């Protein structure tokens, strides 16, 4: 823990980075953090809470998971791998889109869901409903990831987002069935193999959602189980000078710092 602070500050100094971290227990009590209340662009990490919103609607009966969402070529935006494959068929279901958003970071799928649920305003309203007064979605993809220096649009803080993760996975925000499904989606995420989970012990159960945005943003949020201890984690980083591979390695390095702290308990 001053090993934790010290090691993160050395990474910041050496990589010319800012590293925001919060680790909380299942009830949201603080385990560790660093720059934990500094705002960072969310970029694709918001797709996890978006999926949670969708599952809340499914739980409540105001959405159906197998409902077909129709679209054309105008919905294809940069990095829409599933949406592009399903384009000729003319639709994705709510659940197909949500799973693609979480596991592939599919932007088109994300925007399909945004239009169904009420846009950025409704995403922000869900954050407020589950006790998160900080996280805000202002735009759809891909402009939400512009990350213009100083802009508070489309931001969160590590602590706010870690607490949101814990509410969704551990705090009863979703039914048991929906909670389990989203947990499995996070475990099976296809975009995180080089980021946080690359820095955790291989026996920990880990699920996460990555983000990449302009001006150096590289993020990863999710959960881990170190044997029986469950945690929620949010990592937001800004490293304008690094290459993309170096930013992945940065986040994996944060995972190793986290791991030293957890192992010490």
UniProtKB/Swiss-Prot annotation:
Sorted UniProt keywords: Antibiotic resistance, Disulfide bond, Hydrolase, Plasmid, Signal
Binding positions for a beta-lactam per the UniProt entry: 47, 105, 141, 212
The EC number(s) this enzyme carries: 3.5.2.6
Leading EC class: hydrolase
InterPro entries found in the cross-reference section: Beta-lactam/transpept-like, Beta-lactam_cat, Beta-lactam_class-A
The keyword Lyase appears for this protein: no
Family, per entry: Belongs to the class-A beta-lactamase family.
PANTHER family noted in UniProt: BETA-LACTAMASE (PTHR35333), BETA-LACTAMASE-TYPE TRANSPEPTIDASE FOLD CONTAINING PROTEIN (PTHR35333:SF3)
Other information: The class A beta-lactamase family has a specific amino-acid numbering system, sometimes called Ambler or ABL numbering and often misspelt as Amber. A multiple sequence alignment was used to derive a consensus sequence and then the consensus was numbered taking into account insertions and deletions. This allows use of identical numbers, e.g. for active site residues, despite differences in protein length. UniProt always uses natural numbering of residues, hence there appear to be differences in numbering between this entry and some papers.
Protein's UniProt name: Beta-lactamase GES-1
Name of the gene: ges-1
């Amino acid at each position: 823990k001053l090993t934790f602070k010290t090691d993160l500050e050395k990474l910041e100094r050496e990589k010319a980075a800012q590293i925001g971290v919060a680790i909380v227990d299942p009830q949201g009590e603080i385990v560790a953090g660093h720059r934990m209340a500094q705002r960072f662009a969310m970029c694709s990490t918001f797709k996890f809470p978006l999926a949670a919103l969708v599952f809340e609607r499914i739980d409540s009966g105001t959405e159906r998971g197998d409902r077909k969402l129709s679209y054309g070529p105008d919905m294809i935006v940069e990095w829409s791998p599933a949406t592009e494959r399903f384009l000729a068929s003319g639709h994705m279901t709510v659940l197909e889109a949500a799973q693609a958003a979480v596991q592939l970071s599919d932007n088109g799928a994300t925007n399909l869901l945004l239009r169904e649920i009420g846009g950025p305003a409704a995403m922000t309203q869900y954050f407020r409903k589950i006790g998160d007064s900080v996280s805000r979605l202002d735009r759809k993809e891909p402009e939400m990831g512009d990350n213009t220096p100083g802009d508070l649009r489309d931001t969160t803080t590590p602590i706010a987002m870690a607490r949101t993760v814990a509410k969704v996975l551990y705090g009863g925000a979703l039914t048991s069935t929906s909670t389990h499904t989203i947990e499995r989606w996070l475990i099976g995420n296809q975009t995180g193999d080089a980021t946080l989970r690359a820095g955790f012990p291989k026996d920990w159960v880990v699920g996460e959602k990555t983000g990449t945005c302009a001006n150096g943003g590289r993020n990863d949020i999710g959960f881990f189980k170190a044997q029986e201890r469950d945690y929620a984690v949010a990592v937001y980083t800004t490293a304008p000078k690094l290459s993309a591979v170096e930013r992945d390695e940065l986040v994996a390095s944060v995972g190793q710092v986290i791991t030293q702290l957890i192992l010490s308990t």
